[PDB]
Design a protein around this motif. Sequence first.
Motif, PDB file in Angstrom:
ATOM      1  N   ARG A  98       0.823  -1.221   0.000  1.00 13.12           N
ATOM      2  CA  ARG A  98       0.000   0.000   0.000  1.00 13.12           C
ATOM      3  C   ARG A  98       0.862   1.279   0.000  1.00 13.12           C
ATOM      4  NH1 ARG A  98      -3.551  -4.297   0.392  1.00 13.12           N
ATOM      5  NH2 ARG A  98      -3.354  -5.422   2.374  1.00 13.12           N
ATOM      6  N   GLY A  99       1.558   1.522  -1.113  1.00  9.75           N
ATOM      7  CA  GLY A  99       2.417   2.692  -1.261  1.00  9.75           C
ATOM      8  C   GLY A  99       3.264   2.728  -2.517  1.00  9.75           C
TER       9      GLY A  99
ATOM     10  N   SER B  49       6.115   8.894   3.127  1.00 11.18           N
ATOM     11  CA  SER B  49       4.731   9.220   3.430  1.00 11.18           C
ATOM     12  C   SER B  49       4.111  10.123   2.367  1.00 11.18           C
ATOM     13  CB  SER B  49       4.664   9.910   4.792  1.00 11.18           C
ATOM     14  OG  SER B  49       3.323  10.084   5.216  1.00 11.18           O
ATOM     15  N   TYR B  58      -1.032   8.413   3.997  1.00  8.27           N
ATOM     16  CA  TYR B  58      -0.480   7.070   3.727  1.00  8.27           C
ATOM     17  C   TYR B  58       0.999   6.961   4.126  1.00  8.27           C
ATOM     18  CZ  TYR B  58      -4.860   6.980   1.078  1.00  8.27           C
ATOM     19  OH  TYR B  58      -6.182   7.096   0.722  1.00  8.27           O
ATOM     20  N   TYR B  59       1.428   5.768   4.598  1.00 11.61           N
ATOM     21  CA  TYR B  59       2.775   5.522   5.131  1.00 11.61           C
ATOM     22  C   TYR B  59       3.426   4.229   4.658  1.00 11.61           C
ATOM     23  CZ  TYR B  59       1.076   9.069   8.445  1.00 11.61           C
ATOM     24  OH  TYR B  59       0.547  10.218   8.988  1.00 11.61           O
ATOM     25  N   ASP B  61       5.843   0.841   5.292  1.00  8.04           N
ATOM     26  CA  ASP B  61       5.915  -0.140   6.387  1.00  8.04           C
ATOM     27  C   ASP B  61       7.097   0.058   7.340  1.00  8.04           C
ATOM     28  OD1 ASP B  61       3.926  -2.410   6.930  1.00  8.04           O
ATOM     29  OD2 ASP B  61       3.992  -2.481   4.727  1.00  8.04           O
ATOM     30  N   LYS B  64       5.785   3.047   9.512  1.00  6.28           N
ATOM     31  CA  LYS B  64       4.413   2.874  10.002  1.00  6.28           C
ATOM     32  C   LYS B  64       4.362   2.791  11.543  1.00  6.28           C
ATOM     33  CE  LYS B  64       0.251   0.070   9.065  1.00  6.28           C
ATOM     34  NZ  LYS B  64      -0.257  -1.175   8.430  1.00  6.28           N
ATOM     35  N   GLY B  65       3.498   3.613  12.140  1.00 11.54           N
ATOM     36  CA  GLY B  65       3.315   3.678  13.586  1.00 11.54           C
ATOM     37  C   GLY B  65       4.158   4.724  14.290  1.00 11.54           C
ATOM     38  N   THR B  68       4.244  10.487  11.433  1.00 14.90           N
ATOM     39  CA  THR B  68       2.955  11.159  11.227  1.00 14.90           C
ATOM     40  C   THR B  68       3.126  12.382  10.313  1.00 14.90           C
ATOM     41  OG1 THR B  68       2.110  10.372  13.366  1.00 14.90           O
ATOM     42  CG2 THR B  68       0.993  12.302  12.439  1.00 14.90           C
TER      43      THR B  68
ATOM     44  N   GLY C 102      -6.384   0.486   3.296  1.00 13.30           N
ATOM     45  CA  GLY C 102      -5.148   1.251   3.280  1.00 13.30           C
ATOM     46  C   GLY C 102      -4.706   1.770   1.924  1.00 13.30           C
TER      47      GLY C 102
END
Lengths: 214, 216, 127
Positions: A98-99, B49, B58-59, B61, B64-65, B68, C102
């Motif tokens: 997803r990117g 991002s 969207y980010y 992996d 991710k987390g 921001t 997502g």
Amino acid sequence: QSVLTQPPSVSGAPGQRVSISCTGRSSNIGAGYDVHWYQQLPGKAPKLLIYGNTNRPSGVPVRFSGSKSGTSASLAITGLQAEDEADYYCQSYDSSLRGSVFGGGTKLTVLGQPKAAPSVTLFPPSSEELQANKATLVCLISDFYPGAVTVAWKADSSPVKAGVETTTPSKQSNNKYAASSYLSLTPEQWKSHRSYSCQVTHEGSTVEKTVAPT
Amino acid sequence: QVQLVESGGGLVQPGGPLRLSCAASGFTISSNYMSWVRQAPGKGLEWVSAIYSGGSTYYADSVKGRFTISRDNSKNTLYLQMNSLRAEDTAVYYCAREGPGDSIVYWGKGTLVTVSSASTKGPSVFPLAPSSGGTAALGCLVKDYFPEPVTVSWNSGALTSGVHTFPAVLQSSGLYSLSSVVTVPSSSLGTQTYICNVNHKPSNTKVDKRVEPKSD
Amino acid sequence: KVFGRCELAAAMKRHGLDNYRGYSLGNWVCAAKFESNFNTQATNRNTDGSTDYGILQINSRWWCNDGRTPGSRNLCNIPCSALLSSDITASVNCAKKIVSDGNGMNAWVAWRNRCKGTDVQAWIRGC
């Protein structure tokens, strides 16, 4: 493992046609997602070269072309020249991760480019540095092509190994190379010899610069 | 007209935070698809991002987390909040404006983020006096500093022609050293003022060193 | 059924797609044009064993059930046949669930390639 894969290096002669591959997955290129290409010159941000699979933005010459089918993509360059030397990246989107995603990149070398011998400038330690109880000899090498060079330091006629720090050659804003070589000594070691020399070898060409405690 | 200026880059300890900014002018962020892309020294490009014109985020992996993305329409600025930073996060961070199909049309100059536990060290600046056939070389030696970068200008930005700031050497001690050289006409030596303006933001080092011929 | 662009833009507004998850009406109109060419009966079979059904080309491996795709998940909880209807309700409701993932609207390959980052407002202009 690898999301988008490109060969790490490619080389051609001036005027020759060369191609750069970009292998994808069923989740990206194979999923139907378009591939974009970027050209990155050294000490610069990348610039869009091909958008969609084949489209060229304004200013990009007709000698650059793109192709894409199945799980693979390709960038072709016809009539190779000096200004083409850069890093090339492919880019797509992956629906599983997803990117947006980039290839690992390819370094393009143009082997043949007119050769250029290096310019050498040697600085002795400054009076201000000697007054601080330190000594640094600065050997600056610029405007050379290709990028392979050997640096040799001498204290009179004897080769010196200890206290030498040299950079790995790097490209300037003119598609030549630059390098630096530093020799660290104590003020006593500097004053113990009559002459200090920095010798640069570059494909049969030799340039020597000399300093003397004066 | 279209400009992207990034700030907030510097040295941080492992596990610590950092907040990046991106000030835009010549276009509106709220009406465009914006993104952040990073590149580690001597490595490839990595997408980080994205923020869509409608407000969607969207980010990747690997971030991710912890990361921001946000925007502020009042100041027309893009942000990147980074938490629990590690050694793999050391990179030049680019602010980017997307065109059709997430292709990047415009890029910022990029800001360096170094994640290390090593001590900050300011450099010692020494003049490189002109030697004793119409041109002469002179400069400044920027000795023992950590981390990168160091900026060097001549005569408060006025002197640009013949300027050559060399890539830094990474010594076995873990500290860097750099040299800046300017080629000038020999007739000006001893008359024209030559001052090198050295800046190392991490240590708050700001020096002006005047370079002149050696007196004997 | 083959829709007109203003005819579809009005139907999508009455089904609540305008600004759904921060995605303006033009994005949804542009997507249906490059996915199905405004045809409700459009069905694309893929070499991987799955099929994309209807005006918004919904895949039979992850979202709908066609009883023909091995490894089917049916996350939309509907038969693929319901998405071939002249009434866009079933396709819109499944699309609302998809875009909430997502991937967002990138889940639609043709939207990413032909609509994303363009003047989508032009598709709903003059209606």
